[PDB]
């Protein structure tokens, strides 16, 4: 996707107002939008904090709406996959590790949704990078800036996050679906924990392939460009060559030390 984000963004908080006014804190935008620019392929990052817990069918109304404003990845010239997470003032002030995540939308959950399954409130350790990275880059597109909202992060929350993400893959099917992004979310992990700073996919690929033995850079400069919209993502084909770079870099990162 190349258009102007600037309408899918208003249709996207128009959705959040009608079902949230009411119970609304904050909608910050983040994520790549901020920090490093949209890629042809990245999503909207929404981060909504509410002072109470939705009812349920303020979850199905929102998340029902949420999807008709998206478009599934590769699907949409204008329309961008979108992504909101909604959390709990008194489930996230002050901060605690792990925190509860109160609603999640995305385009992963598309099929979930049309079957009529709704995701409830969970445990959330990816908050500890959410909201990281939203207190060093987003825009406060109603209510108070990140900073000044949610407490620090602190940085052994930060390490611990990133460290347990990496159970999430362990075998091929673990990243079947999502191979470019799973490269470059190790890569991302790898990156953060020697330096406890976030980088863009490609800024963290690039440094990630400096890191490398020669014959792991291949992959991660194949998804830093299919990320970048250069080249295709061809990464499906060279299986073993990716399963070979997850167990490799996944030991990298298990040897940094806190
Ligand atoms: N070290 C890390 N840095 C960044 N994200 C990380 C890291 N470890 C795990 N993640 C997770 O990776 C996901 C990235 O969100 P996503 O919207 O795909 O990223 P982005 O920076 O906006 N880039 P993109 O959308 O591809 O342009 C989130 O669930 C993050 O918390
Ligand atoms: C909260 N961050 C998101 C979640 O980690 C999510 N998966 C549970 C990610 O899924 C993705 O990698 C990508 O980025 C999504 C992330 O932005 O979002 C795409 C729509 C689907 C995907 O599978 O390609
Ligand atoms: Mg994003
Ligand atoms: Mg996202």
Do not use: C
């Not at 990078?129 to 602190?154: M, N, Q, W, Y």
């Not at 673990?174 to 979310?185: E, M, P």
């Amino acid at each position: 996707v190349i258009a102007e984000v600037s309408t899918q963004l208003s249709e996207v908080v128009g959705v959040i107002e009608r079902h949230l006014e009411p119970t609304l804190l904050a909608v910050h935008l983040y994520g790549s939008a901020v920090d490093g620019g949209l890629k042809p392929h990245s999503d909207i990052d929404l981060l909504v904090t509410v002072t109470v817990r939705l009812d349920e069918t303020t979850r199905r109304a929102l998340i029902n709406d949420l999807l008709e404003t998206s478009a599934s990845p590769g699907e949409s010239e204008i329309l961008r996959a979108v992504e909101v997470t909604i959390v709990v003032h008194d489930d996230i002030i002050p901060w605690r590790y792990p925190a509860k995540r109160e609603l999640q939308f995305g385009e992963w959950q598309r099929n979930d949704i049309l079957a009529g399954i709704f995701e409830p409130a969970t445990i959330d350790i990816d908050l500890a990078i959410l909201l990281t990275k939203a207190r060093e880059h987003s825009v406060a597109l109603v209510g108070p800036a990140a900073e000044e909202l949610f407490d620090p992060v602190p940085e052994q929350d930060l390490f611990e996050a990133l460290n347990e993400t990496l159970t999430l893959w362990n075998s091929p099917p673990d990243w079947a679906g999502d191979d470019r992004n799973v490269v470059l979310t190790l890569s991302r992990i790898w990156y953060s924990a020697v330096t406890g700073k976030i980088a863009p996919k490609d800024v963290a690929a690039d440094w990630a392939m400096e890191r490398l033995p020669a014959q792991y850079q291949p992959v991660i400069l194949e998804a830093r460009q299919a990320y970048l919209g250069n080249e295709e993502d061809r990464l499906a084909s060279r299986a073993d060559q990716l399963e070979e770079f997850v167990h490799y870099v996944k030991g990298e990162i298990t040897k940094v030390v806190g």
